[PDB]
Write a protein that binds this ligand. Structure first.
Ligand code: HEM
Ligand SMILES: [Ca+2]
Ligand SMILES: [Ca+2]
Length: 329
């Protein structure tokens, strides 16, 4: 099919997405960058979608976190997402797609801006939300590992799928976990979609990067990096440790599994056979930059081995003294 300006796509319904693509790239993502708006939009995809349970209810990836923002942004687990919900709302208002489609589309376009990123399949046609999500369906970083896995399982994800979706923490920071240091990232390369998250969470903790008594946070290996309690434990739990370790220096697997599992997340509450394939709209991401490494001054003896079947791979360290990671602007 050929769209209004001559750009093409397999399914013509998808032509609606070209001016939306252009508008969010310029006016949401600061000129197609992998920065804070892309990171918040990616988080939003999960907080919208995971509000789904075959028994507890919720419409899943239905745009409810925007349509019913006054309800959902008041759930404690949604702290900090009000900003991106406010930023996206006028795009939904202006443009010609459901809030469900818009959230997942913005997250996919966002990921494609990040060096190392992957094109996440995108389907169009989600109906409008019927009702606010129930509260208590979004995992919290202070939840037990088995609780997080059971919650994700109830929505349809295996434990290894949860590991793959957490590749998102490779381009991610926290503003509310420790509000003394907002914008502190979960890995040393929040602008690069890469394996450093899976490496750096496996290091022995050393220090709190800000204050010491924040719920859902544990010690970080690096100044200027924050570590969630949930990620710390998922990196070490028998259900997930070996899969977590398997991501290290495995860019193609991180890309392939993130894409396929985000597509599945993006379809929670929906039926792929009742939607239109618009995957060809998503831009080609930039090449990965950098290579898998231990942080400066670390060695393999600083890794806490938790995978019972295979040892953690040796990785070179960056040269020099240890360093601080700058916050996400
Ligand atoms: C599996 C359980 C998960 C837990 C416990 C968890 C927890 C968190 C927390 C506590 C934050 C910091 C929010 C803040 O204080 O600003 C965060 C940020 C983020 N999360 Fe996760 N998350 C989970 C899964 C996911 C998934 C499946 C995605 C997939 C899209 C995701 C994407 C993100 C992103 C991109 C950010 C960065 C937000 C920003 O930079 O401001 N998370 N997550
Ligand atoms: Ca929802
Ligand atoms: Ca990264």
């Amino acid at each position: 099919a050929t769209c209004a300006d001559g750009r093409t796509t397999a399914n013509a319904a998808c032509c609606v997405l070209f001016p939306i693509l252009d508008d969010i790239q310029e006016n949401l993502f600061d000129g197609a960058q992998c920065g804070e708006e892309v990171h918040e939009s990616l988080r939003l995809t999960f907080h919208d979608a995971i509000g789904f349970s075959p028994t507890l209810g919720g419409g899943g990836a239905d745009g409810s976190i925007i349509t019913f923002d006054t309800i959902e942004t008041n759930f404690p687990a949604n702290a900090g997402i009000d900003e991106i919900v406010s930023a996206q709302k006028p795009f939904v208002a202006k443009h010609n797609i459901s809030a469900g489609d818009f959230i997942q589309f913005a997250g996919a376009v966002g990921v494609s801006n990040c060096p190392g990123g992957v094109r996440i399949p995108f389907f169009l046609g989600r109906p409008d939300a019927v009702a606010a999500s129930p509260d208590h369906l979004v995992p919290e970083p202070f939840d037990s590992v088995d609780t997080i896995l059971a919650r994700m399982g109830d929505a349809g994800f295996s434990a290894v799928e949860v590991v793959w979706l957490l590749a998102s923490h490779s381009i991610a920071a926290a503003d509310k976990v420790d509000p003394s240091i907002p914008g502190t990232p979960f890995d040393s390369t929040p602008g690069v979609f890469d394996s450093q998250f899976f490496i750096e969470t496996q290091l022995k903790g050393r220090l709190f990067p800000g204050t010491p008594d924040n719920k859902g946070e544990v010690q970080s290996p690096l100044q200027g990096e924050i570590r969630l309690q949930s990620d710390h434990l998922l990196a070490r739990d028998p259900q997930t440790a070996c899969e977590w370790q398997s991501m290290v220096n495995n860019q193609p697997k991180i890309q392939n599994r993130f894409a396929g599992t985000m597509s599945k997340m993006a379809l929670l509450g929906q039926d792929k056979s009742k939607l239109i394939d618009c995957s060809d709209i998503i831009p080609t991401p930039p090449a990965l930059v950098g290579a898998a490494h231990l942080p400066a001054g670390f060695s393999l003896s600083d890794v806490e081995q938790a995978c019972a079947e295979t040892p953690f791979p040796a990785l070179t360290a960056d040269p020099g003294p240890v360093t601080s990671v700058p916050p996400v602007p």
